[PDB]
């Protein structure tokens, strides 16, 4: 087509979606990771994660307001990945990289799994 | 912080949100623009438009599944802006610029209003 494109649009959209999350506006699901609860927007979760895409395209699961993750999932790892979904920024540290990578494999977030593998390889 | 950032994340999120819209997945509102109907995600509309942000933060309107726009709004102008919300690309043409600018003013989409004003000024 002959469209023009606003470079910062996608980043500005994501910033606004994170502001809605902050303010608990139109959040429609609670993700439970053992004793912790995280409120989010199903569409943002599906857009970032192959696991959430599969869950919320299921004709029964699409209607659930609570999703319980596998008990082996680390709440801090999930929190770091949820923040990445809404900001593009990943708080990857020596102390959390193993939990973050395991969580990203489970959630099916291939680009995160990729940077974790690279950071681990560099320390070996 | 000491975060790393994935450059293409925001664009990839928006591309996936547009794929959900295409496939009518988890759309939760119908926008009516006279005889036409457009299905969308409230969160994407709020993230792009000051008018939708005000509508869906209202304690009563947040629960509506149908929103009727002012009868003066042009359906093609709205369609072009809805596509821009989900793609960052604006199909601005000599034949639609007046309707697009009027619709963007109504929807409170300041960057679109800005490029329309500039394109109009260049033709004068």
């Amino acid at each position: 087509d002959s469209c023009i494109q606003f470079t910062r649009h996608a980043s500005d959209v994501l910033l606004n979606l994170n502001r809605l999350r902050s303010r608990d506006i139109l959040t429609d699901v609670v993700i439970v990771v053992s004793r912790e609860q995280f409120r989010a927007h199903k569409t943002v979760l599906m857009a970032c994660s192959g696991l959430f895409y599969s869950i919320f395209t299921d004709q029964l699961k699409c209607n659930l307001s609570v999703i319980n993750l596998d008990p082996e999932i680390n709440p801090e790892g999930f929190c770091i990945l949820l923040d990445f979904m809404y900001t593009s920024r990943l708080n990857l540290r020596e102390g959390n990289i193993m939990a973050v990578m395991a969580t990203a494999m489970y959630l099916q977030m291939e680009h995160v799994v990729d940077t974790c593998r690279k950071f681990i390889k560099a320390s070996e | 912080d000491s975060c790393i950032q994935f450059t293409r994340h925001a664009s990839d999120v928006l591309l996936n949100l547009n794929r959900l819209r295409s496939r009518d997945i988890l759309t939760d509102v119908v926008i009516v623009v006279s005889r036409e109907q457009f299905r969308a995600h409230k969160t994407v509309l709020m993230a792009c438009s000051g008018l939708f942000y005000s509508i869906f933060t209202d304690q009563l309107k947040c629960n509506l599944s149908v929103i009727n726009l002012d009868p003066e709004i042009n359906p093609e102008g709205f369609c072009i802006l809805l596509d821009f919300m989900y793609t960052s690309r604006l199909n601005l043409r000599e034949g639609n610029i007046m309707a697009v600018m009027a619709t963007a003013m109504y929807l409170q989409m300041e960057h679109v209003v800005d490029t329309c004003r500039k394109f109009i000024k260049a033709s004068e």
């Binding site: 023009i4 494109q5 606003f6 470079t7 | -």
Partner: peptide, 4 residues
């Protein structure tokens, strides 16, 4: 704004 750019030409994509």
């Amino acid at each position: 704004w750019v030409i994509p």
